[PDB]
Amino acid sequence: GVSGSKGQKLFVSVLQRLLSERGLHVKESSAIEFYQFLIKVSPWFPEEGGLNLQDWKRVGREMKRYAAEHGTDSIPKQAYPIWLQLREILT
Amino acid sequence: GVSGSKGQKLFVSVLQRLLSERGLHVKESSAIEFYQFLIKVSPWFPEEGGLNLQDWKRVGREMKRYAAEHGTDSIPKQAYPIWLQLREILT
Ligand SMILES: *C(=O)CCCCCCCCCCCCC
Ligand SMILES: *C(=O)CCCCCCCCCCCCC
């Protein structure tokens, strides 16, 4: 269950592994910010979610919902690009 | 939330991705049994650990100590095979 920085090291390490295999590298600081954004919008994801296209699509919808409510500038510039690359991996 | 299976779906999904790309397939129930064993012996791992050799070697030591103390029949048969394969994936 998420709470602050809990799970952050492991998430970042898995994310970096997945993206790097497609030739895309993310700074650790950017990957941390992405994690913090994800658990803010979709806290159910570590707890109840799977790394599968269905649940990842739900995360995407929830990220877009957040932008609709708080504005585009409110979300990390790397969030949609990282989300999209993981979506492609899951296809 | 007081679900007893927090994180289990995410774990099973990531484990099955990593193992399948090496040609190895684990029954869902077996992957769940492994997760429950992992968080029993090494509750710090999802919280603070990463998918790296130092952390995974530590989980390895802790699993072995559990076996020394409780006997090898108290441990899932698939636990050491799974741990070993993940050690190699990190190498
Ligand atoms: C709170 O939500 C608990 C979160 C537990 C997440 C399960 C851990 C996810 C691990 C996936 C990677 C496993 C690699 C060995
Ligand atoms: C998971 O199901 C979250 C449940 C959290 C329950 C909190 C209940 C707290 C009751 C005691 C409150 C005392 C302080 C006012």
Residue numbers in the entry:
A (entry chain A), B (entry chain B): 2 to 92
Q: What does the article say, verbatim?
A:
Mouse mammary tumor virus (MMTV), a causative agent of mammary breast cancer and T cell lymphomas in mice, is a representative of the Betaretrovirus genus. The N-terminal domain of Gag, matrix (MA) protein, is responsible for Gag targeting and PM binding. Myristoylation of MA and the highly basic patch of amino acids located near its N-terminus mediate the interaction of Gag with the PM.
The protein crystallized in the P3121 space group with two molecules in the asymmetric unit. The final dataset was collected to 1.57 Å resolution, and the final model was refined to R = 22.6 % (Rfree = 26.3 %). In the refined structure, myristoyl groups and their connections to the N-terminal glycines were well-defined in the electron density map, as were the first 91 of 111 amino acid residues. The CTRS region (spanning residues 45–62) is accessible on the surface of the molecule in an orientation similar to that observed for M-PMV MA. Interestingly, the myristoyl group of one of the dimer-forming MA molecules is not buried in the hydrophobic core of the protein chain to which it is covalently attached, as is common for the sequestered form of myr(+) MA proteins. Instead, the myristoyl group is sequestered in the hydrophobic pocket formed by the interface of both MA molecules in the asymmetric dimer unit. This interface is formed predominantly by helices 1 and 3. However, the myristoyl group of the second MA molecule in the dimer extrudes into the neighboring dimer unit. Therefore, the two nearest dimer units in the crystal are interconnected by two myristoyl groups, forming a tetramer of MA molecules around the two-fold axis of the P3121 space group.
